[PDB]
């Protein structure tokens, strides 16, 4: 599924991601935009052989299992394919764990380079929330 902007905002809010760990809803929508362009089925191979999955491009190196990243961890206890579903529950639940691990949203390189320090509220402007 490819989400619309306000559609994704509403889903993220309903699942309690808004203001989670101090990060306003706009930060999360901006991250999803530059990581996946809002596409739940997005995948990308990393130079080390791991793969990023889903709307928030969660890395099989640490967070999910895909059976082809030898030596990796599965900290959200999920098959990486669960992160590709039309329902974003698994991606949100896993994202709540990543952002809580000490580095905040700096875990998402696209967020740091393209969202951090910008007017992130712009990503939820206009939406009925």
Q: Which residues are catalytic?
A: 35, 52
- What 3-state DSSP class applies to 67? coil
Please say whether the beta carbons of 123 and 26 come within 8 A: yes
Determine if 65 is a binding residue for Na ion (CB under 5 A).
Answer: yes
Ligand-binding site membership of 66 (annotated): no
Looking at residues 74 to 93 of the shown chain, list those that interact with Na ion (rule: CB under 5 A).
Answer: 74
CA angle 66, 27, 106 (to 5 degrees): 60
Rounded Cα distance, 20 and 98, in Å: 11
Nearest approach, Cβ of residue 105 and Br ion (Å): 7
Determine if 72 is a binding residue for Na ion (CB under 5 A).
Answer: yes
Closer of 51 and 57 to Br ion (Cβ)? 51
| Residue 48 token pair | 């080390």
Q: Residue 100's binding partner, choosing from Br ion, Na ion, none, with beta-carbon cut-off 5 to 8 A by kind? A: none
Chain residues that interact with Br ion, rule: CB under 5 A: 11, 24, 26, 51, 66-69, 87-88, 104, 121
- The structure tokens 């691990």 sit at 101
Determine if 60 is a binding residue for Na ion (CB under 5 A).
Answer: yes
Query: Which residues, in sequence order, are bridge partners of residue 45?
Result: 51
Binding residues for substrate: 101
């Amino acid at each position: 599924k490819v989400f619309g902007r306000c559609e994704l905002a509403a889903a993220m809010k309903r699942h309690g991601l808004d203001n989670y760990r101090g990060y306003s809803l706009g930060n999360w929508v901006c991250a999803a935009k530059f990581e996946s362009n809002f596409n739940t089925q997005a995948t990308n191979r990393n130079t080390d052989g791991s793969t990023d999955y889903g709307i928030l491009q969660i890395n099989s190196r640490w967070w999910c299992n895909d059976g082809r990243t030898p030596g990796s961890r599965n900290l959200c206890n999920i098959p990486c394919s669960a992160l590709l579903s039309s329902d974003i529950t698994a991606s949100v639940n896993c994202a709540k764990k990543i952002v809580s691990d000490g580095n905040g949203m700096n875990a998402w390189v696209a967020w740091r380079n393209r969202c951090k320090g910008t007017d992130v509220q712009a990503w939820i402007r206009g939406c009925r929330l």
